[PDB]
From Swiss-Prot:
Protein purpose: Host-defense peptide that has antimicrobial activity. Exhibits activity against Gram-negative E.coli (in vitro). Probably contributes to the antimicrobial barrier function of the small bowel mucosa.
Protein's recorded name: Defensin alpha 4
Native source organism of the sequence: Mus musculus (Mouse)
Compartment(s): Secreted; Cytoplasmic vesicle, Secretory vesicle
Residue range from the parent sequence: 61 to 92 of 92
Annotated disulfide bonds: 4-29, 6-21, 11-28
Tissue expr: Paneth cells of the small bowel.
Length: 32
């Protein structure tokens, strides 16, 4: 939720992965 984004392979403009967005997808949150 929040302002998190699901990106395939690797999150764009963000190195704060929150967890896996399923298979071959990364879910990152710009929190900390």
């Amino acid at each position: 939720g929040l302002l998190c984004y699901c990106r395939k392979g690797h999150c764009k403009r963000g190195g704060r992965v929150r967890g896996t967005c399923g298979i071959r997808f990364l879910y990152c949150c710009p929190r900390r």
